[PDB]
Each structure stands twice: as C-alpha cells, then as structure tokens.
Design a protein around this ligand. Structure first.
Ligand SMILES: Nc1nc2c(ncn2[C@@H]2O[C@H](COP(=O)(O)OP(=O)(O)OP(=O)(O)O)[C@@H](O)[C@H]2O)c(=O)[nH]1
Ligand SMILES: Nc1nc2c(ncn2[C@@H]2O[C@H](COP(=O)(O)OP(=O)(O)OP(=O)(O)O)[C@@H](O)[C@H]2O)c(=O)[nH]1
Ligand SMILES: COc1ccc(/N=N/c2cc(OC)c(OC)c(OC)c2)cc1O
Ligand SMILES: [Ca+2]
Ligand SMILES: [Mg+2]
Ligand SMILES: [Mg+2]
Lengths: 436, 155, 426
C-alpha cells in the first residue's frame, strides 16, 4: 500500500472534490463521521482503501486531502455540510481575497501570501505516509486561483517532492457555464507553466459534460451540482484501480507507463458508458458489447473531439460490475473490424483490460440510474489536439489586440510570458501533428 | 487713459462709471490687447444696460476682435437672449463669420441655446453657412443627435 | 472582497446619493431608523457590502457626505433616511465653488480634502476586507467635479490596490444652460481617464430626453431625472448586494469589462422605463438594447460593444433568458466585436426592485460612447477658442496649458474608441 494525497484548488477543484469524497465514502462503506464498520483493523492498516484514507486510533477514516481557496465561501460549505466531520480541519485552507479571475493574481501576488502555509500542511500529511507515491491535483483552467495558484503549487511540489508523481484533473472552459472573458488566457498560461511539472492530466471539458447532462439525463439547464455528480462518477472510475485490488493502473507510475508514451503529450481522453437517467429505473440492461461500442462514440467523451480524425497511442478499458472476461475479448475483437480505429505504427495495437466486479455506486440525490455494468475507457489519441486548437484560437483573437493584458502586467507579470506560453502551445500542437 | 478704465467698467457691469468715463472723453471704441471693445465685454458678461448705453454713444455694433468675433458672436455663444435682440435691433450682422468660419447661428446651435437659435433664424441667419470644416448649423444638429435643435432648423 | 466605502460630493452627488440609500434600504428591509423589518433572509446575506452593523442590531450606511456648500447637509438631513447617516461622516465647508472647477480642485476644495480623508480612514480601518470605493458626483459643477477628482486622486495614493468606481453625471444644456459646464466636465474627464477603474456615465441629456420624449413629461424636474438614476444605480449594484450564482465584486467586473485601461466608461441601460407614481423576457432583452433605454445619449447601433453585462431581476425561466440573450447576439451580430469571444455575461437575481415584477439592467462598454465625449468636446472647443471666462480659472492658480492638455486627452480618448470600432478579427 502506497499513499496518494489529493489537493483541491479553487472553487471548481473544491466543489468537484466534495462530490468525489462523498462518492468514495459510499463505495468503501465509510460514514460521514469517518467510521467504517467493515474495517476489522482499528488504528491503521495496509488495505487498498488506505491509499486515500488514513486511520486514527479511534477508528476514524480521514481523507488524505487538502482543500485550498483564496476566498472562503466555497470551502465554508464543506466546513458546514454533510461531510463536515470527515476532514481534518487544518486540511481546509482559505485566504480572504480571491484572484479575481486573474492568473497573475493567483500566481504572483495574492497566491504568494498563502503558498508556504499550504506546503507546511501538505508536509504534515506526507509525514504520515509510509510510501507516498504522489499527488492528484484538482483545478479549473479558467479561474485565477485554479490557474495561477495551481501553477505555483505544482512548481513548489516539484522542488520538495522530486521523485513523486503528479496527476491533474483539470476543468477546461465552456461558454455555456463560464465565469470570465479571460479564461482562454488563464488556461494557456497555466498549461505552459505546469507542463514540465505534471506527469498525466485528465481534462474535463465543461461543454462535453453539459451536453451529456442535457441529452442523456434530460436536464434542461444543468447546474454545477449536476455536472459535478457526473464528473465524480468518471473520476471514481479512473481512481478505482488505486483504491481497490486490481491488475491494471495499480499505482501512479503505471498511469504514465500505460498512457503517456512521451512526457509532453500527457493528456488522455476519458470516455464513460452508460449514462442513464434515474427516472428510467426499469431500463433494459446493456451488454458488454453495447457499453464497449459506446466508448467509440464522440457523444460519450469527457472532451469534445473526434477520435476518427486522430490516431491512438494507448487504450485502457476499465470495467465495473457484471462483466465476463470472454465477453470483453469478443467485444474488442469486433471493434478491431472497424476502419475508424487506427493506432500509430510504433505502438502495439493492443487494448489493456482491467475488470472490477463490483457495479458502480449511485449517490442518493443523483441523476444516474443504477446499472449492473459500466466502463471507462482511457485513451491517448492525437484527436485531443482539436481541444488545444479551439483554446489557442480564442487566445489569439484577444492577444492580437492585447485585450485585457494590462490586468496581468499590473500584477507582477511580464508581457513576454504571454508569447512564451503561446509558443509552447504552438509546439504542443506540432507534437500531436508529428505523431499524426 | 480712460479707454482702459472703460474696458474694465464694461466687463464689471459698473453702469455709473461707464456714463462718467464717456462724459469725460473716454474712447467708446477702445480695444484691449486682443481687439475686444467695451461692447464685446458688456455682451460677453451679460450687462444689458451697458450694451444699450454704448450703442447710443457711437459703439460699432459690428466691431471685430483679432479672431473676427463680433459682439453678436459672443452674446450668442454665452446665451444672452436680451442682448442678442438689442444687437440685432441696432444693425448687427446676423451672418458675420469669425476666423473659424463660425456665424452666431453655429455658436448658439453648439451651446444648445434654442431660443437664441429661433431669434437668429427669424432675423435671416443663413442655414447654408458652412464653418471651416464644411459644417452648417443643421450638420451640427444631425452629427450630435440634437432632435430639438434639428426640428427648429426645419420649422 | 466585501465592503465598499461610498462617498457623495457636491449637490448632484448628494441628491443622487441620498436617493440610492433610500432605494436599496427599502430592498434590504431597512427602515429610516436603521432597523431590519424585512422577511427574506436573502436581504441580509451581503448587507455588510454597503452597511456597517451597529449596537441594537442597527444598520448604518458606510457613506461619507462631502460639500463645500453647507446648505446641502440640511437638505440631506431633512430627507426620510437623513437620520440613518452617521453624524461624524458629514464634512461641509462654508462657501460653495460657484461652478468653478479650479475652486473645487485647487483652493476651497484643497483646504477641506484632509478632513474628508480622515473620515475615509476611519471607515476603511473598520472593514474586514475592503473591495474599494464608489463616488457619486456631477462633472458640470465645481465641488463634485473639481473636489471629487482631487479626492479620487488622494484616495488612489493611500489605497492603490483597491477599486475606484464612480457614478458621474454628464452635463447638458437641456437641463442646465451654464456655459462653463463643458470646461468643468472636460477637466474632470482628464482626471477620470487616469484615476478610476470604472465609471458609469449618467448623461443628463439622455435623462432629459427619456422624460420629455418617452415619459411625456413637458417640464422634467430633478426628481424625475433622479428616479431614472436610482433605478439604474439599484440595477447595477444588484449582484454586489444579493448572493446569486456568481460571487461578483468590483475587481471581477473591471477585469471582465475593461479590455484597455483608458476605456472604462460604461453606458448603463434600464428596462422598463417608468415615471414617478405611474412584461416578458423577449421584450426585456429587446428594450434593454434600444437607444431609447440608454442613460447616455449615444446610439449603440453607431458603434460596437467590446463587453456587456446584463442583470435580470424577478421570477423568470433561466433557460428563456439564455435563449433570448443568444438570439439578440445572433440578430445583432455586427454590433459586437468579433475578437473578444463570449463578451456578453448574464445574471439572474430572484428579488426584483420596488413596484416591478420584471426588470433588466444593462452595462455596456461600447465604442458609441465616443458620441457623448465628442458632444462635450465640441462645446469645450467653442468656449475655449474665444477664451470665454478663462480668467475665472487662471485666477485660482490654474495654468492655461491644463485646458489644452485636458482637450488633447479627450480627443485622444475619442480616437481610441474609433480605433477599436474599426478593428477586425481577419
Ligand atoms: N464543472 C465545474 N466547473 C466549475 C465549477 N465551479 C467553477 N467551474 C468552472 O471553473 C471556471 C472558473 O474558475 P473557478 O474555479 O470558479 O475559479 P477559482 O479557482 O476559484 O479562481 P478565482 O475565483 O478567480 O480566484 C469556469 O470555467 C467555471 O465554469 C464546478 O463546481 N464544477
Ligand atoms: N441628474 C441630476 N443632475 C443634477 C442634480 N443636481 C445637479 N445636477 C447637475 O449637476 C451640474 C451642477 O453640479 P452641482 O452638483 O449642482 O454642483 P456642485 O458639485 O455642488 O458644485 P458647486 O455648486 O459649484 O460648488 C449640472 O449639470 C446640473 O444639471 C440632480 O439632483 N440630478
Ligand atoms: C463579458 O464577460 C463578463 C463581463 C462581466 C462579468 N461579470 N461581472 C459582473 C459584476 C457585477 O458586479 C458589480 C455585476 O453586478 C452588476 C454583474 O451583474 C451581472 C456582473 C463576467 C464576465 O465574464
Ligand atoms: Ca484498518
Ligand atoms: Mg474563486
Ligand atoms: Mg452646488
């Protein structure tokens, strides 16, 4: 058992973190006060759930997690919510004034007032670990805290924890539910400065999640609560291998080995199926072949892009529930007889398979129906460069006029940092083109 | 030099002092360094009684300063309706043009003195007079979206 | 980002300022004595933004009242909410400014500026996390214009990291036919371009035009004009005062609305327009973007919107608002710049204002505001070319070059708006 520390930064990282830890508690049988009646060893242990939960001498199971925000409103909802007793009170850190949707404020001026405290609190959690493997960092691209503070934090973690892995869950902006006009700027600045410090990053496109809520769940105008419950389902599917027994992606290093062929193209695409509305409680149960075919349909992706336009470098299928391995083998065999699934010539055309035989858990109050089998596909495809081009174009339209740039320069940032960031993105776009 | 003291009295509105200076030979048509006369000053500062007194004692109602401003241009700019009427009754040139191509009509239109605009039009002000930029008083009303002024100019 | 320190200077500043406090106190359930008589819990959630909590659960406005004319304090005191203001917060001189910007900025006003700053310090030091400041004032007089700009500059030196926001009333000969008002407004605009983060441009020309042509009032009074001002000030401060799905503050408004530092002059709008003592979502979205509903006498169809923020108030389908707002941006596509993606932001607030079930407030940063600046510039130049009344200013220690510098800066501002109105994405 090797521990993982989760770090939740800014409103999006915090709200998604709350929804994830609620789901993890229901999956492991942990009550909101921290008690776990199925844990026979009190005061400690080396079980797979111990990667995410420490234990006190009183039998309390505490998340290995830190919540950080530059203003207190969002974290105050965690301090007074259903799971208020679950977290270490010193694990919830708040400033007084936020970054005002400005990367430079989060990174250079306001963020510097709290960075040392956050590192000292992370150190206290790291000291309790027998074999810390690394960090899971949750944040938006668009917020000033989510972009700027996360970059500053990732730079410091690389100095103090050199050999540890760092994985991100990043929220990519969408016009339908965005906060600020400058989100494309923040997104490009944080991508540039974090690239060399992150080993693997799972982007969640708010527009993709918004469309799934509208289409599959019949939600007319989805809110952050609806988006976060679906996102937490997907995040749980991705982290399940770290928290339960299994033979695939069993540690952070394995995510890099399986999904990241080269350090800069470290952005896997996640696809999830099936998403069925809770109002359809008596739905027909979809077979392994149906849910597996559903992973190759663009409508089910976590990022809007078209994998038919790109080439695959890796593909992992993570099943949960009533799934017979020979049915997976037959379903995959049928997928290989489809011309719209091309791998790069330098990678073996194989699919890696992991099966957890417990079906997914539904959260009371959620929008999802219970299902007997579900799948999360993680793939590294060159088609994700389409997401980068869309963001790069919105950056170029404003930057060509230097619109809003004065707000960043006025907060201790040089104007040349914008050009250095954009050039890094042009090279990242070329890295995908060079693979194919 | 009574002309210098007459310029000061006309600007300050000292009626008694104006009568006294005139009685002692003061030049009613004296000029300051920029060519302004006692009449220009009384019309700029709104001293109606001084304007009438000077006009009955040989003041040139159409005197121009170094910028071509007449007392009528200044009265129309500042908005002294009663002085505009007295100047017109005494022979002021309603269509006098200054160094900027402006007529009294242009200045009253710019400053929004609508009652003065009506008086000028009734006395034959030229609606086709263009300033050095080609603008008539109607062009000014259109370019600034002054519907009230534009209606008056069409009447 | 919580507390705001409000300052009101001069006659216009204090009259519109008193009306602001009366309107928002009624919305927040605050009576003229300072007690909370409301029913909704949403009224006290962000009350701290404008009010200080005091003994016996008494809510006192974080307001400073300034004027060189002592008679203004009495008119304020004689008002309904005149006793709610803190007696220590009234700073009043002996002689007014007589519409002389130089008296407000360099002589009478400069003697009284340290006294006001003492009160600002006392109010600021009692704030847990001060956002910034809001000033109400006219630009045509001498105190709100000359002294107001001096106060903005001195506050700026002491609190350079806080936001400075003004509600500045632009002069018009339709309401006040005083020929020195273009001088005072031009000298003030020169200061506002450099020293404020955001300015709401409230134009007496548009206020008069709305009363006369739309409300059919033949002889509009200050009370009729100020009714439009208070509805606008209530509308644009909605999200600072009520929770909503956004945690708005003055700095987030500035970062998202101001793409170029000098272009921080907003054109506010309001729908429906009503007179004193006297609707669907598609109609509200329509009226909101109409020239007749703008508080600045500019046709937005003569320029381009760089950024827009809209606030809808009342009970309505949030999906319908998204649909109508999407529709207006498609059919009026040539009136928005193409190089600032997603430049229109909407917010919905459950609590509507007094006497209305539905209301919409518009905050535009449009290149068409150059029409307001050109109107004042043409009047300034007509007076300035003849040097009319210049001695009234130079006699108070003002150099003649200060006028030339203000005129040049305003014409440069107009050229800057024209530059972005003609810019294309390609
Ligand atoms: N999916 C999801 N997106 C969110 C959530 N909260 C905010 N966002 C998105 O995150 C972006 C805004 O960043 P935030 O996380 O709110 O900002 P922040 O990190 O707190 O930064 P500042 O408030 O600027 O200091 C926008 O693109 C929002 O749509 C959430 O709970 N879920
Ligand atoms: N909308 C509106 N405009 C007003 C009001 N009071 C004055 N004004 C305008 O404000 C300008 C004059 O400014 P005032 O506020 O009267 O002057 P002040 O700031 O007190 O300055 P001094 O009297 O010169 O010391 C003119 O353009 C008036 O039309 C009011 O209550 N509402
Ligand atoms: C063009 O993009 C944007 C522009 C403005 C944005 N929001 N700004 C606010 C701030 C407010 O506080 C005063 C509001 O109260 C009046 C407010 O009411 C709706 C909005 C956010 C943006 O993404
Ligand atoms: Ca145990
Ligand atoms: Mg935030
Ligand atoms: Mg006054």
């Amino acid at each position: 058992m090797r521990e993982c520390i989760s770090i939740h930064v800014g409103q999006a990282g915090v709200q998604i973190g709350n929804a994830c830890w609620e789901l993890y508690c229901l999956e492991h049988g942990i009550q909101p006060d921290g008690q776990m009646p199925s844990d026979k060893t009190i005061g400690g242990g080396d079980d797979s759930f111990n990667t995410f939960f420490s234990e006190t001498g009183a039998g309390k199971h505490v998340p290995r997690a830190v919540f950080v925000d530059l203003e207190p409103t969002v974290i105050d909802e965690v301090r007074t919510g259903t799971y208020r007793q679950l977290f270490h009170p010193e694990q919830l850190i708040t400033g007084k004034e936020d970054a005002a949707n400005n990367y430079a404020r989060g990174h250079y001026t306001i963020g510097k007032e709290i960075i040392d405290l956050v590192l000292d609190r992370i150190r206290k959690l790291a000291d309790q670990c027998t074999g810390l493997q690394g960090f899971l960092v949750f944040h938006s691209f668009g917020g000033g805290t989510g972009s700027g503070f996360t970059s500053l934090l990732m730079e410091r973690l690389s100095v103090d924890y050199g050999k540890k892995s760092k994985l991100e869950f990043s929220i990519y902006p969408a016009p339908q539910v965005s906060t600020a006009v400058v989100e494309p700027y923040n997104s490009i600045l944080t991508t540039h400065t974090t690239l060399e410090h992150s080993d693997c990053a799972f982007m969640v496109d708010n527009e993709a999640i918004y469309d799934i809520c509208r289409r599959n769940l019949d939600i007319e105008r989805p809110t952050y609560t609806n988006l976060n419950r679906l996102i937490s389902q997907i995040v749980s599917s991705i982290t399940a291998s770290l928290r339960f027994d299994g033979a695939l992606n069993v540690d952070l290093t394995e995510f890099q080995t399986n999904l990241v062929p080269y350090p800069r193209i470290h952005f896997p695409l996640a696809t999830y199926a099936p998403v069925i509305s809770a109002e359809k409680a008596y739905h027909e149960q979809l077979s392994v072949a149906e849910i597996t075919n559903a992973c190759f349909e663009p409508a089910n992706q976590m990022v809007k892009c078209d994998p038919r336009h790109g080439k695959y470098m890796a593909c992992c299928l993570l099943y949960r529930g009533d799934v017979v391995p020979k049915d997976v083998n037959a379903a995959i065999a049928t997928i290989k007889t489809k011309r719209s699934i091309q791998f790069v010539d330098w990678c073996p055309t194989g699919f890696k398979v992991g099966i957890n035989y417990q079906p997914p858990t539904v959260v009371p109050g959620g929008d999802l129906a219970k299902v007997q089998r579900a799948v999360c596909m993680l793939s590294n495809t060159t088609a994700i460069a389409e997401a980068w081009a869309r963001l790069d174009h919105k950056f170029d339209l404003m930057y060509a006029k230097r619109a809003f740039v004065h707000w960043y320069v006025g907060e201790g940032m040089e104007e040349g940092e914008f050009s250095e960031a954009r050039e890094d993105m042009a090279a990242l776009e070329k890295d995908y083109e060079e693979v194919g | 030099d009574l002309g210098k003291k007459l310029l000061e009295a006309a600007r300050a509105g000292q009626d008694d002092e104006v009568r006294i200076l005139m009685a002692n030979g003061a030049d009613v048509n004296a000029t300051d360094a920029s060519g302004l006369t006692p009449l220009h000053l009384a019309a700029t500062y709104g001293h109606l009684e001084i304007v009438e007194v000077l006009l009955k004692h040989g003041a040139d109602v159409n005197a121009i300063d170094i910028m071509g401003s007449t007392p009528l241009h200044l009265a129309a700019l500042i908005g002294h309706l009663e002085i505009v009427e007295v100047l017109l009754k005494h022979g002021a040139d309603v269509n006098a043009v200054d160094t900027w191509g402006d007529t009294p009509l242009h200045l009253a239109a710019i400053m929004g003195h609508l009652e003065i605009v009506e008086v000028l039009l009734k006395h034959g002000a030229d609606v086709n007079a263009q300033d050095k930029f080609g603008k008539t008083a109607f062009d000014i009303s259109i370019d600034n979206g002054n519907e009230d002024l534009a209606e008056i100019l069409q009447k | 980002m919580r507390e705001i320190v409000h300052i009101q200077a001069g006659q216009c500043g204090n009259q519109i300022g008193a009306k602001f406090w009366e309107v928002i106190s009624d919305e927040h359930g605050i009576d003229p004595t300072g007690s909370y008589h409301g029913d909704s819990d949403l009224q006290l959630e962000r009350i701290n933004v404008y009010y200080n909590e005091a003994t016996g659960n008494k809510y006192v406005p974080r307001a400073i009242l300034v004027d060189l004319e002592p008679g203004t304090m009495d008119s304020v005191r004689s008002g309904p909410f005149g006793q709610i203001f803190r007696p220590d917060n009234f700073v009043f001189g002996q002689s007014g400014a007589g519409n002389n910007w130089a008296k407000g900025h360099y002589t009478e006003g400069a003697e009284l500026v340290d006294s006001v700053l003492d009160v600002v310090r006392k109010e600021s030091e009692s704030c847990d996390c001060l956002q910034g400041f809001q000033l109400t004032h006219s630009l045509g007089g001498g105190t709100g214009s000359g002294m107001g700009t001096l106060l903005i500059s001195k506050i700026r030196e002491e609190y350079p990291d806080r936001i400075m926001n003004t509600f500045s009333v632009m002069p018009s000969p339709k309401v006040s036919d005083t020929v020195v008002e273009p001088y005072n407004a031009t000298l003030s605009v020169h200061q506002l371009v450099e020293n404020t983060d955001e300015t709401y441009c409230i134009d007496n020309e548009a206020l008069y035009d709305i009363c006369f042509r739309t409300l059919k009032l033949t002889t509009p009074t200050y009370g009729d004009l100020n009714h439009l001002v208070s509805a606008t000030m209530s509308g644009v401060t909605t999200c600072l005062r009520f929770p909503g799905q956004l945690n708005a503050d003055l700095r987030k408004l500035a970062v998202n609305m101001v793409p170029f530092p000098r272009l921080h002059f907003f054109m506010p709008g309001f729908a429906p327009l009503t007179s004193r003592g006297s609707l669907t979502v598609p109609e509200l979205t329509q009226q909101m973007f109409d020239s007749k509903n703008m508080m600045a006498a500019c046709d937005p169809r003569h320029g381009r919107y760089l950024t827009v923020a809209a606030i809808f108030r009342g009970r309505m389908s949030m999906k319908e608002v998204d649909e109508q707002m999407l529709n207006v941006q498609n059919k009026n596509s040539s009136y928005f710049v193409e190089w600032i993606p997603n430049n229109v932001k909407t917010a919905v607030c459950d609590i509507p204002p007094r006497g209305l079930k539905m209301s919409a407030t518009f905050i535009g940063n449009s290149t068409a505001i150059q029409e307001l600046f050109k109107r004042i510039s043409e009047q300034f130049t007509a007076m300035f070319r003849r040097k009319a009344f210049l001695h009234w200013y130079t006699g108070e220690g003002m150099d003649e070059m200060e006028f030339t510098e203000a005129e040049s800066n305003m014409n440069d501002l107009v050229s800057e708006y024209q530059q972005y109105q003609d810019a294309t994405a390609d």
